[PDB]
Design a binder for this molecule. Structure first.
Ligand SMILES: Nc1nc2c(ncn2[C@@H]2O[C@H](COP(=O)(O)OP(=O)(O)O)[C@@H](O)[C@H]2O)c(=O)[nH]1
Ligand SMILES: [Cl-]
Ligand SMILES: [Zn+2]
Lengths: 335, 337, 60
């Protein structure tokens, strides 16, 4: 059978990949980092409470000025906040309140959001008016991130990601290969690559300009809800339904470390590294953020300031602060 | 700072707008329609637009034209497939070629109803073999509006065809995103929501619906004689009931009022004359050929599982019936809230 | 139908197989070196003076 021989060859190739990865696994990260000092207790304070949303917050994204941020809620509003003063700068009424993601363009000129409408809507902050509705996904918009004012990458419950030309409203490139809903994406620092995490329990590394999947990583049969790059672009971390964060190395082409406690069994919604990469912060369904030592795997601290799920988080580009957003309708800024 | 003071006043003006919007949001009631495909959800939404919204103008009707054509092709493609699967013969040799022509239509791209295709459709529909296959539709998936459109193919094929309100009520509007239709009634905003077009993993978005005001669960009464061949001959109505049970036992719907609409009561009245409920549910002890006995049995079965379930029989394509039933349901929902 | 999907999977697996990989020991040393080189620049790890923290300044 032609289909049986192709099925057999795919099994041979999966073994070849398994064996090549084993050949590189000469020591573990934990062994390599054994002698570095612990970070010791991380004890951040709530510096700001951002009040104004009237329903669950699903997403947030910092502006590149480390000062303005955008948040999205099932109250049908995107709010742009000045974190330093807590002043609201804009409140944008959404046509669809069923929002799952938002993004701040690096220029500060636009924001984006979408969700169960299957559309990535772009809003012009220097005009506030909807400037584009990007239609083409056939399932929910789970995540979006601008490359520039004319290009945005999206992930979808339709199992694809896409790169869009905002002016034309078309998908330039469709990234196919996941077999389950894609939940999250993260752009490499150099914007050459991005990673996606999906309900097929895999993370995929994609070449933005070439359109292909370069590498696939398995996340142990748990949905990946959140994904983030390590700051040098050579590794990334995932957060999954099974209460576990995982670090993956691109050049060694494998998982290096897990971060979990047996007495935490709830889902992870969100992940981010600190500016140096030493801390991995994750948001949990149990209403807390846990801060992990990325090199040594010990928990370094907690952020406990919410009365419902922590749905989203983000670390400023200047490294100065963490934002948490929550189903309790509040954001908090910590450091 | 003048600039700093202006930024504070801008923030306060935004807070005013958010408070106003919050006041309005407290007047909103979310009605989540649930139920398997073909149960009546999209038709119910269209009726709300007819009864309590802007209805359908000439221009609106014109917009639905190509979808009427697509429903026709989809129906005939289903019957062509069933001829092969059930091994039923065409009476007319010409229908071999007609079936191939229709089979190869890309329905998504249909914007016209050209003479070539109209002739093929009519000749297929008039074949006694296709009529025999139509009579065996409980064994496959065919729209309950297929016969309606095919009977009226001449009207639909005429140059200048404008869809009727019934044509609109019956047409499939394809979408794989969320459907929300809000309407005003008595200073309340009803937000009617249908997720049945979504093909993605429900676990990732079901929490978007925590504590909705009301769940309206639609069941086709007419599916009592259909079995799922893949699910150990599970009756389709047993699958609908299992879905219903998952809904009513879901922890974040415990505060939601639950309204069960046993829809397609008109189709039950016809089917019960030839397809016997006792063959599918041998516990049934009522007379044969008796629609009232059958629908009473189906109701008692569906809710044979603390929580109160309200229920009504409906015909979702009958505007007067939906006007009557929803008047009562609105009273219940408002009293509870 | 399925032969096309299956060929696509094989081609993808060949692409994934035929990459240059480094030792985990090197990969780990490089992550550790990065963290060490950037630790002083990381306010969440290495507290900055109150006057440099915009969220503590009485200014705002
Ligand atoms: N005769 C009849 N047709 C109905 C009734 N309810 C719905 N339909 C039709 O059956 C088809 C499927 O119903 P639809 O509302 O699309 O179900 P959905 O898949 O849940 O949205 C459409 O052509 C409807 O107009 C009913 O009570 N009687
Ligand atoms: Cl009622
Ligand atoms: Zn009632």
């Amino acid at each position: 059978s032609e289909l049986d021989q192709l099925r057999q060859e795919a099994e041979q190739l999966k073994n070849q990949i398994r064996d090549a990865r084993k050949a590189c696994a000469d020591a573990t990260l934990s062994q390599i980092t054994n002698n570095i000092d612990p970070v010791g207790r991380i004890q951040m304070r709530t510096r700001r409470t951002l009040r104004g949303h009237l329903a669950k917050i699903y997403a947030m994204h910092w502006g590149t000025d480390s000062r303005l941020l955008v948040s999205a809620s099932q109250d049908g509003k995107l709010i742009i906040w000045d974190s330093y003063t807590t002043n609201k700068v804009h409140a944008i009424p959404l046509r669809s309140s069923w929002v799952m993601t938002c993004a701040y363009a690096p220029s500060g000129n636009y924001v984006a959001c979408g969700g169960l409408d299957n559309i990535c809507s772009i809003y012009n902050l220097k005009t506030v008016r909807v400037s584009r509705e990007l239609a083409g996904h056939t399932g929910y918009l789970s995540c979006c991130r601008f490359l520039d004012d004319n290009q945005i990458v999206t992930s979808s419950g339709d199992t694809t990601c896409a790169l869009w030309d905002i002016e034309t409203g078309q998908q330039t490139t469709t990234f196919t290969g996941h077999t389950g809903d894609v939940m999250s994406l993260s752009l490499a620092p150099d914007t050459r690559l991005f990673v996606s995490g999906a309900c097929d329990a895999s993370a995929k590394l994609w070449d933005v300009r070439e359109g292909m999947c370069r590498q696939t990583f398995t996340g142990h049969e748990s949905d990946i809800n959140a994904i983030c790059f390590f700051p040098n672009g050579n590794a990334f971390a995932t957060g999954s339904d099974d209460a576990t964060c995982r670090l993956f190395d691109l050049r060694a082409d494998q998982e290096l470390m897990t971060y979990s406690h047996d007495n935490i069994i709830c889902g992870i919604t969100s992940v981010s590294f600190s500016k140096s990469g030493r801390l991995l912060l994750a948001g949990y369904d149990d209403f807390n953020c846990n801060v992990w030592d990325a090199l040594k795997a010990d928990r370094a601290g907690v952020l406990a300031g919410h009365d419902n799920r922590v749905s989203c988080l983000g670390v400023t580009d200047d490294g100065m602060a963490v934002a948490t957003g929550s189903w309790d309708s509040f954001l908090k800024i910590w450091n | 700072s003048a600039e700093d003071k202006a930024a504070v006043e801008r923030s306060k003006m935004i807070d005013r707008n958010l408070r106003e919007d919050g006041e309005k949001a407290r007047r909103e009631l979310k009605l989540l329609l649930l139920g398997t495909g073909e149960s009546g959800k999209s038709t119910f939404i269209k009726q709300m637009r007819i009864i309590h919204g802007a209805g359908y103008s000439e221009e609106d009707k014109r917009g639905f034209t190509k979808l009427v054509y697509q429903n026709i092709f989809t129906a005939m493609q289903a019957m062509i497939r069933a001829m092969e699967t059930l091994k039923i013969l065409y009476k007319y040799e010409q229908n071999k070629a007609n079936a191939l022509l229709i089979r190869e239509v890309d329905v998504e791209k249909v914007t016209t109803f050209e003479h070539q295709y109209v002739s093929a459709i009519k000749t297929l529909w008039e074949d006694p073999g296709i009529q025999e296959c139509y009579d065996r539709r409980r064994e496959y998936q065919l729209s309950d509006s297929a016969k309606y459109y095919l009977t009226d193919v001449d009207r639909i094929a005429t140059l200048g065809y404008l869809p009727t309100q019934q044509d609109v009520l019956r047409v499939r509007v394809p979408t794989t995103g969320i459907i929300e239709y809000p309407f005003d009634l008595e200073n309340i905003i009803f937000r009617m929501v249908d997720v049945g077009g979504q093909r993605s993993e429900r676990r990732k978005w079901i929490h978007c619906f925590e504590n909705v005001t009301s769940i309206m669960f639609l069941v086709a009464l007419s599916e009592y004689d259909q079995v799922l061949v893949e699910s150990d001959n599970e009756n389709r109505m047993e699958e609908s009931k299992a879905l219903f049970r998952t809904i009513i036992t879901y922890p974040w719907f415990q505060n939601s009022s639950v309204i069960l609409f046993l829809n397609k009561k008109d189709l039950l009245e016809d089917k019960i004359l030839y397809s016997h409920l006792v063959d599918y549910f041998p516990e049934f002890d009522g007379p044969q050929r008796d629609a009232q006995a059958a629908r009473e049995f189906i109701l008692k079965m569906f809710v044979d599982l603390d929580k109160i379930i309200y229920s009504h029989f409906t015909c979702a394509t009958d505007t007067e019936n939906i006007r009557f039933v929803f008047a009562a349901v609105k009273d219940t929902i408002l009293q509870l809230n | 139908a399925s032969i096309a999907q299956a060929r696509k999977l094989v081609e993808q697996l060949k692409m994934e197989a035929n990459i240059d990989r480094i030792k985990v020991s090197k990969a780990a040393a490089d992550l550790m070196a990065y963290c060490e080189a950037h630790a002083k620049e990381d306010p969440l790890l290495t507290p900055v003076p109150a006057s440099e923290n915009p969220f503590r300044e009485k200014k705002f």
